[PDB]
């Protein structure tokens, strides 16, 4: 189960956007709908004050889980 949950998240980095403070309540909704619109070959424009850093949400490999599974079997 832990391995399956790890594969649920692995290989797809979290997509965080850092809107400058003081942005209107309408420009946060469009930013969030854009940062959740990233797909295949996604490409767009962001102002100089915004950032679109990609942070990994699951780092590791399958060796420990499979080693434990093999030993238990």
């Amino acid at each position: 189960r832990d391995f399956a949950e790890f594969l649920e998240i692995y290989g797809l980095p979290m997509r965080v956007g850092k809107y400058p403070t003081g942005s209107t309540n309408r420009e946060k909704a469009t930013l969030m709908q854009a940062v959740m619109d990233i797909g295949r070959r996604a490409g767009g424009i962001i102002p100089m004050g915004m950032t679109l850093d990609f942070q990994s949400a699951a780092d590791g490999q399958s060796d420990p889980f499979m080693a434990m599974i093999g030993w238990a079997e």
Partner: protein, 140 residues
Amino acid sequence: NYATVNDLCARYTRTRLDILTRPKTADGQPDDAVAEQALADASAFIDGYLAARFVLPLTVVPSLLKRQCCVVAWFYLNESQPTEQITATYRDTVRWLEQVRDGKTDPGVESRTAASPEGEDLVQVQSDPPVFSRKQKGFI
């Protein structure tokens, strides 16, 4: 507006308020609409500095915002020739509003019931529906 003219004329002496206001009116006699307009402009300033992380038609008004509106209205009402202290206090309240907008300082509460004004979600994330999470008591 956040503060009424009856409060600006109490924090700042009414006689000096009349001295500042009587030229600006058309007739030349002490008027009250000028002070209310200045208070409305100061409240607009504060509203712009607070709308970053608050629902702006404030459910509960922070109790310091009356002071922060009075000071900005007083500075706006001394635009022709202000004292050095008026300018310094206006810079201090602009710094405080910048800190509130950035997130360094919360505006406060209503002193009556200690309730903080609500606001929209500054941070909001969405992910796909959770599967294989520990909350799925099946399997295991």
